[PDB]
Amino acid sequence: RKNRPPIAIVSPQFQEISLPTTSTVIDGSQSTDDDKIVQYHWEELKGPLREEKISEDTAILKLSKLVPGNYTFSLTVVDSDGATNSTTANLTVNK
């Protein structure tokens, strides 16, 4: 009933890491909602061609086997009543 749309809060807006440590994390479990979030959706936009894409549904994003490049991920949260809110997260990996 007259629910406010959720808010997606990615803790690391600009994630920075080098090539040796590819396994990084982007936290989206801090995203708030007036009731509760039924689905966290992670999708990449600027991700360079690699072994695999990302479409994980975990609230906290675990990354692996990164290659050098610039990554851009958008977190989509879903209210219990269907309202959505998508915010973007950036990750730059060095040579």
Binding site: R4, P6, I7, I9, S11, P12, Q15, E16, I17, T24, V25, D27, S29, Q30, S31, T32, D33, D34, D35, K36, I37, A59, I60, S80
Partner: protein, 518 residues
């Protein structure tokens, strides 16, 4: 019994007897009017919106409550020093709570200037939840306790409680408790409230350190009559495999047989107070040890009593495995590391595993001629037979007790924050200013009266707990470690007021100073 005769004197002593201490403590309180006498449901929806982990649903009552569930509400720093430097343990026996010198004030802000008058005919109603029929918000390590220093006045906290939820919404079995459905006691300015309570048979707090490690419990001169597999190959060749057993003794103390093993572990993340030794990433929440309940994660904070660090590395503290207190005048949002007091739990490193280290190794395959002896790490280890551990320390600022939740079972119900776990802890003392309507209309109106006289209450409160003590009798020769106030000139005496009259506790004082071997 009248308006002009005090309903109780100020007792704030602390008398030490042969085997017990009776710490009396009196304070002045100020009880405002909460919620404007209303019961309101509270949720993360009300609070603007919270995540799935922080989702909640509950009610905020117009009731205050009394919470003397911190150790400094009763013990002065000198009393704490006497207790911890001289005793191997203590436990509360009985308390005697008194609520007297009540005086209800009526404030009027009609002209823009407030005029606090005296309402003699108005009452305050206080009841104690001695059957535990209400949610027990004490033992949650909340604020609003009696202040550490007797001189200052404190404001009584609001009583609210949480219940079951599916998000911000109430499932069908989420209870709503009306606290007016309890027989209260209506006190005017000449009345007083007192009750007595007998604590449970809780064990003594281990107010001592161990002067003997768990793995070094043996004669360092005689060797065991047991053997251990020393060698598995008698050389460096290819097909050289043997089984050479050597007697385990003082030469190799690590491998010899032991009857007992360190307590359970649940690993934490090792964060260093030297910020240049940490990772450059935000590992605060992602790298934490949590436990999941009905889907939503919640931080351990502090979890099973484990040693904070190995010997020699004082900087490292578990990410959430230690109690962190705030210094005087410290904000509540992202304060620097030098404005908080992180309590070390290293006195129990003799029996407990290090909070930031794995419990040990474990073999994870059957080695044969083809597969090497592969072994893994034990990050978390539940209880095993023969495990001995030691509970978390109680501190001068820390909690005293907690209510063991009514469940079909539990294991070792001592509170993970330190203290004494009781099925029936001291009852919740709930106090509320009785509403006084301002002016009902001269014509009947079915609606509930919404215009009340704005008024508050104040008075004194006296709690007196009798603690049993466990005296030291050790044949140790050399002096023990004892808590001393360092003799070196300083601007302010520690544990005392400064030039502004604000009393500050400069450090968290534990109890584990005297040593007791295993």
């Amino acid at each position: 019994d009248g308006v002009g005769s005090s309903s109780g004197n100020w007792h704030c002593d602390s008398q030490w007897l042969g085997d017990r201490v009776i710490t009396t403590s009196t304070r002045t309180w100020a009880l405002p009017t909460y919620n404007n006498h209303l019961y309101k449901q509270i949720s993360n929806s009300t609070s603007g919106g919270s995540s799935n982990d922080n989702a909640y649903f509950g009610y905020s009552t117009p009731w205050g409550y009394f919470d003397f569930n911190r150790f400094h509400c009763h013990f002065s720093p000198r009393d704490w020093q006497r207790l911890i430097n001289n005793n191997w343990g203590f436990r509360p026996k009985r308390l005697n709570f008194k609520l007297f010198n009540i005086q209800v004030k009526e404030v009027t802000d009609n002209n823009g200037v407030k005029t606090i008058a005296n309402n003699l005919t108005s009452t305050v109603q206080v009841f104690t939840d001695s059957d535990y029929q209400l949610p027990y918000v004490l033992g949650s390590a909340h604020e609003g306790c009696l202040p550490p220093f007797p001189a200052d006045v404190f404001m009584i906290p609001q009583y609210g409680y949480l219940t079951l939820n599916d998000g911000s919404q109430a499932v069908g079995r989420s209870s709503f408790y009306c606290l007016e459905y309890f027989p209260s006691q209506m006190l005017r300015t000449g009345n007083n409230f007192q009750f007595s309570y007998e604590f449970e048979n809780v064990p003594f707090h281990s107010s001592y350190a161990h002067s003997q490690s768990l793995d070094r419990l043996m004669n360092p001169l005689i060797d065991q009559y047991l053997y251990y597999l020393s060698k598995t190959i008698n050389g460096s060749g290819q097909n050289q495999q043997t089984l050479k057993f050597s007697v385990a003794g003082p030469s190799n103390m690590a491998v010899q047989g032991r009857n007992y093993i360190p307590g359970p572990s649940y690993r934490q993340q090792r964060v260093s107070t030297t910020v240049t030794q940490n990772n450059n990433s935000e590992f605060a929440w992602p790298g934490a040890s949590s436990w999941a309940l009905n889907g939503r994660n919640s931080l351990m904070n502090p979890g099973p009593a484990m040693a904070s660090h190995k010997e020699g590395e004082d900087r490292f503290f578990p990410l959430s495995g230690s109690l962190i207190f705030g210094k005087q005048g410290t904000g509540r949002d992202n304060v620097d590391a030098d404005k908080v007091m992180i309590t070390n739990e290293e006195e129990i490193k003799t029996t407990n595993p290090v909070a930031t280290e794995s419990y040990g190794q474990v073999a994870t395959n059957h080695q044969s001629a083809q597969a090497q002896a592969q072994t893994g790490w034990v990050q978390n280890q539940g209880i095993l037979p023969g495990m001995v551990w030691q509970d978390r320390d109680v501190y001068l600022q820390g909690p005293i007790w907690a209510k063991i939740p009514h469940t079909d079972g539990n294991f070792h119900p001592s509170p993970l924050m330190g203290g004494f776990g009781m099925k029936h802890p001291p009852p919740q003392i709930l106090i509320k200013n009785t509403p006084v309507p301002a002016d009902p209309p001269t014509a009947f109106n079915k609606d509930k009266l919404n215009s009340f006289i704005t008024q508050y209450s104040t008075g004194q409160v006296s709690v007196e707990i009798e603690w049993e003590l466990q005296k030291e009798n050790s044949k140790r020769w050399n002096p023990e470690i004892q808590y001393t106030s360092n003799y070196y000139k300083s601007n302010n005496v520690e544990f005392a007021v400064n030039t502004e009259g604000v009393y500050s506790e400069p450090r968290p004082i534990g109890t584990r100073y005297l040593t007791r071997n295993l």
